[PDB]
Ligand binder design. Structure first.
Ligand SMILES: CC[C@H](C)C1=C(CCC(C)C)/C(=C/C(C)=C\C=C\C(C)=C\C(=O)O)CCC1
Lengths: 10, 210
């Protein structure tokens, strides 16, 4: 779930 | 611990018709992450559980948003991209049945009771804090957050609409329809992916992953 992971961490 | 003023602030902070709808869905998935970050205590959950809650509730969360946005129009849905999909356009594209379900079970009922943005945001926060989601590291904490949302929602309803004692229950009883409509829309989207002649963008595609 690359996109969701990246958006939540930022 | 769960004030309705911050939930409303989250709503206001985020401001072939099948192809147009799928493009708007992908656009709003990015916006949905920013919305959830602004819901109190969501960002404090473990990162794996933030992922689980959004992957479990994204379709219901997006449907509630464009349904409430469309109470201003008749026989139509307002997309976040500025486009309008008329009931006749959806019917002529072969998706009239589910379109009519959205208009009848969600949009018209939202318009009939004049559901406001604070109530919409609270209902979306209840959907977001779904303690039944599989894989949650601590389902009890999510259940506690959901309880705080609908405790604050009821207090808001009794205070702003004292003459409508059944309003809090009326809001919650749209959630079974939202759940059923969300499941059907996912069913359609998987069929579109299987056929493969409908453009599906990367974030929408990721939500279709196992
Ligand atoms: C062609 C109808 C078909 C079944 C379909 C639906 C249902 C659209 C409704 C209007 C019937 C979708 C809804 C979701 C799961 C999300 C919608 C997000 C949008 C469109 C948000 C916005 O514009 O704010 C996306 C995938 C395809």
């Amino acid at each position: 779930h690359k996109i969701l992971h990246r958006l939540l961490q930022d | 611990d769960m004030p309705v003023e911050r939930i409303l602030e989250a709503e206001l902070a985020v401001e072939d018709p099948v192809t147009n709808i799928c493009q708007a869905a992908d656009k709003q998935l990015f916006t949905l992450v920013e919305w959830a970050k602004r819901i109190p205590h969501f960002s404090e959950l473990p990162l794996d559980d933030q992922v689980i809650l959004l992957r479990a509730g994204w379709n219901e969360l997006l449907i509630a948003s464009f349904s409430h946005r469309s109470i201003a129009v008749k026989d139509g849905i307002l997309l976040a991209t500025g486009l309008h999909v008329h009931r006749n356009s959806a019917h002529s594209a072969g998706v009239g049945a589910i379109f009519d379900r959205v208009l009848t079970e969600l949009v018209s009922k939202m318009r009939d009771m004049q559901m406001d943005k604070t109530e919409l945001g609270c209902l979306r926060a209840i959907v977001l804090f779904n303690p039944d989601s599989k894989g949650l590291s601590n389902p009890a904490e999510v259940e506690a957050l959901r309880e705080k949302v609908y405790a604050s929602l009821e207090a808001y309803c009794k205070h702003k609409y004292p003459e409508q004692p059944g309003r809090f229950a009326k809001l919650l009883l749209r959630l079974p329809a939202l759940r059923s409509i969300g499941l059907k829309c996912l069913e359609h989207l998987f069929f579109f992916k299987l056929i493969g002649d409908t453009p599906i963008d990367t974030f929408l595609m990721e939500m279709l992953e196992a």
